[PDB]
Paper text:
The modular multifunctional protein large T antigen (T-ag) from simian virus 40 orchestrates many of the events needed for replication of the viral double-stranded DNA genome. This protein assembles into single and double hexamers on specific DNA sequences located at the origin of replication. T-ag contains three structurally and functionally independent domains: an N-terminal J domain followed by the origin-binding domain (OBD) and the helicase domain. The T-ag OBD has multiple functions; it binds the GAGGC sequences in the origin of replication in a sequence-specific manner.
When the wt T-ag OBD structure was analyzed via the program SSBOND, we identified only one pair as candidates for mutation: Phe151 and Asp256. Therefore, to eliminate disulfide formation with Cys216, we also mutated Cys216 to alanine (Cys216Ala). Finally, using a vector encoding a double mutant of T-ag OBD (pGEX T-ag OBDC216A, F151C), we generated a vector encoding the triple-mutant form T-ag OBDF151C, C216A, D256C (termed 3XM). However, under oxidizing conditions 3XM forms higher order complexes (dimers, trimers etc.) as analyzed by SDS–PAGE. To verify that the desired intermolecular disulfide bond formed between Phe151Cys and Asp256Cys, we crystallized the triple mutant and subjected the crystals to X-ray analysis. The triple mutant crystallized in the same space group (P65) and has almost identical unit-cell parameters as the wt T-ag OBD. The final model contains amino acids 131–252 and 254–257, 127 water molecules and one citrate molecule. Nonetheless, the electron density for the disulfide bond connecting the protomers is clear. Despite the indicated changes, the backbones of the two structures are virtually identical. Finally, although the triple mutant has reorganized a portion of the protein–protein interface, the disulfide cross-link, together with the other protein–protein interactions, are sufficient for formation of the crystallographic hexamer.
Author numbering: 131 to 252, 254 to 257
Write the structure that this text describes.
């Protein structure tokens, strides 16, 4: 087994906040985790946080979840909910600073959409 990723793919890092322990609240987040755990979290996060939009993407044999929330949350709050579900699988949760650029990159090589909550993906959300 290859070592689990320690961060998001290098292509995406500019779009993220790396201050994961901040008290700052945000309304856009991304999670890097296994294919199995991302599939589960897609449904769980959709309901828990009443997402405006959520999408799940292929990323280097893992998955990335991307979502927008109608209320603001600390990144650590999302992490707390998600690590509990991911159990013994790697999981990286970060806030997204550049919402449109992040989502756009996740829809194009080397990434691709697996499923998302709005048809035609987004476009009124950006």
């Amino acid at each position: 087994k290859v070592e689990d990723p320690k961060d998001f793919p290098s292509e995406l890092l500019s779009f993220l906040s790396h201050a994961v322990c901040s008290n700052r609240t945000l309304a856009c987040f991304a999670i890097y985790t296994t294919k199995e755990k991302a599939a589960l979290l897609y449904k769980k996060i959709m309901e828990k946080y009443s997402v405006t939009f959520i999408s799940r993407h292929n990323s280097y044999n893992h998955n990335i979840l991307f979502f927008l929330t109608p209320h603001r949350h600390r990144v650590s709050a999302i992490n707390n909910y998600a690590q509990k579900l991911a159990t013994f699988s790697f999981l990286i949760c970060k806030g997204v600073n550049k919402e449109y650029l992040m989502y756009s990159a996740l829809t194009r090589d080397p990434f691709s959409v697996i499923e998302e909550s709005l048809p035609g993906g987004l476009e009124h959300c950006f």
